[PDB]
Scaffold this motif. Structure first.
Motif, PDB file in Angstrom:
ATOM      1  N   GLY A  10     -34.549  10.897  18.581  1.00 43.91           N
ATOM      2  CA  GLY A  10     -34.387  10.682  20.002  1.00 43.91           C
ATOM      3  C   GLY A  10     -34.117  11.967  20.750  1.00 43.91           C
ATOM      4  N   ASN A  11     -33.814  11.762  22.032  1.00 44.95           N
ATOM      5  CA  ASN A  11     -33.397  12.822  22.962  1.00 44.95           C
ATOM      6  C   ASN A  11     -31.930  12.691  23.219  1.00 44.95           C
ATOM      7  N   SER A  61     -31.156   7.095  24.871  1.00 51.07           N
ATOM      8  CA  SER A  61     -31.500   5.739  24.475  1.00 51.07           C
ATOM      9  C   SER A  61     -31.377   5.521  22.991  1.00 51.07           C
ATOM     10  N   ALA A  62     -32.101   6.296  22.137  1.00 54.06           N
ATOM     11  CA  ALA A  62     -32.021   6.097  20.712  1.00 54.06           C
ATOM     12  C   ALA A  62     -30.648   6.365  20.180  1.00 54.06           C
ATOM     13  N   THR A 158     -37.892   6.267  19.880  1.00 52.77           N
ATOM     14  CA  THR A 158     -38.256   5.921  21.259  1.00 52.77           C
ATOM     15  C   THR A 158     -39.507   6.668  21.639  1.00 52.77           C
TER      16      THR A 158
HETATM   17 CL   LIG Z   1     -34.159   8.700  23.188  1.00 52.09          CL
END
Ligand SMILES: [Cl-]
Ligand SMILES: Nc1ncnc2c1ncn2[C@@H]1O[C@H](COP(=O)(O)OP(=O)(O)CP(=O)(O)O)[C@@H](O)[C@H]1O
Ligand code: NA
Length: 340
Positions: A10-11, A61-62, A158
């Motif tokens: 993810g980010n 999100s992740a 994601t």
């Molecule tokens: Cl993410």
């Protein structure tokens, strides 16, 4: 020590949370209740936020989804995560916060970049978000990631990860593909992801076992890939399932899950003989007056779903766990890990 049951890319973001006066939104030309990416003049917000004694929290999100998995599994190293951070103090803070929660993480350091950061500005019962992605866009999966994720059977990305490069998710999916019983799961994440990455998603979806998205994301998927109310949701889920299966029968999980706000979750699954099984799971009602906002609800859903999946639960039970986690999160300011 694990065992690691879910691995994600993810980010990663550090959230900076503060109640602020309306003047502060005005100072930075923010519209209350909108979620935006920082403009150059807004980059000064992160430092100027210090006057409010903001609280630093993990976000993205992740990352939030695996924090749910980790909270529910409890044992240290139950979920693992990789993404990129910068060379700055906030990246060090983010690492410490993830370590306290017991997540297994390896953050790639991106010299010369700043860690992704989100100003979470609470004001007048609304949530106003201003994000600088920073280093997140520099992530490149290390080749020994498979050793970091050793023993995990559930892999998640994601579609936000495509911004750095689609190669990262493609490598995760390709590894999973080669392991019988491994599951690769993907979030559509946002309309922009669907619209910009048609080619990369075409390839990734053929390597995907479980696809998650919300109603708007699936509407865009349907338009971009020509897939063509509840009946309509069933048609879209069913159409989307051809992107996972190529209209061929195979003995692996092939499932499409569409979250629908307060309306029942709809999912379509293809069986080994090509039968399409339609699942419909009602969302237990949460009173309007109890809901703070629905930001992060889909992240909570996915986390609960993946936790239940790691426990061998049925599709309906996984959806029910997702709903339960989202129910709790939407009654809190921010992404609460206090589950009920
Ligand atoms: Cl993410
Ligand atoms: N008003 C509501 N009441 C009950 N559950 C809700 C709800 N809104 C969202 N949810 C829960 O959140 C899950 C994910 O919903 P969805 O994907 O539509 O949220 P979202 O990510 O689009 C929210 P937003 O638009 O605020 O970012 C739903 O499956 C449901 O379990
Ligand atoms: Na919340």
């Amino acid at each position: 020590t694990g065992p690691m049951r879910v691995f994600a890319i993810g980010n990663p973001i550090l959230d900076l949370v503060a109640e602020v006066p309306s003047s502060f939104l005005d100072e930075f030309f923010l519209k209350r209740g909108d979620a935006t990416l920082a403009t150059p003049e807004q980059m000064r917000i992160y430092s100027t936020l210090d006057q409010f004694n903001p609280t630093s929290l993990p976000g993205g999100s992740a990352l939030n989804s695996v924090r749910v998995v980790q909270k529910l599994l409890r044992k240290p190293g139950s979920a693992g995560y990789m993404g990129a951070i910068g060379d700055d103090p906030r990246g060090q803070v983010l690492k410490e916060l993830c370590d306290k929660e017991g997540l297994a993480t390896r953050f790639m350091v991106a010299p010369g970049q700043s860690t992704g950061v989100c100003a979470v500005l609470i004001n007048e019962k609304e949530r106003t978000l201003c994000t600088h992605l920073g280093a997140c866009g520099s992530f490149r999966l290390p080749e020994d990631w498979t050793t970091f994720a050793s023993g995990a059977l559930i892999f998640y990305a994601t579609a936000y990860t495509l911004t750095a490069t689609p190669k990262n998710a493609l490598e995760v999916a390709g590894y999973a593909h080669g392991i019988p019983n491994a599951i690769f799961t993907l979030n559509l994440s946002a309309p922009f992801c669907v619209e910009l990455y048609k080619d990369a998603m075409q390839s990734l979806l053929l390597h995907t076992n479980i696809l998650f998205g919300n109603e708007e994301e699936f509407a865009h998927l349907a338009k971009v890939h020509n897939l063509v109310n509840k009946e309509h949701a069933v048609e879209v889920c069913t159409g989307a399932l051809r992107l996972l299966t190529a209209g061929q029968n195979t003995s692996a999980t092939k499932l499409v899950v569409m979250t629908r706000g307060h309306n029942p979750v709809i999912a379509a699954e293809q069986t080994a003989d090509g039968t399409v099984v339609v699942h419909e799971v009602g969302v237990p009602v949460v009173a309007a007056e109890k809901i703070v906002d629905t930001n992060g609800a889909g992240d909570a859903f996915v986390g609960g779903f993946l936790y239940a999946l790691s426990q061998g639960k049925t599709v309906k039970q996984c959806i029910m766990c997702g709903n339960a986690c989202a129910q709790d999160v939407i009654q809190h300011v921010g992404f609460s890990l206090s589950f009920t």
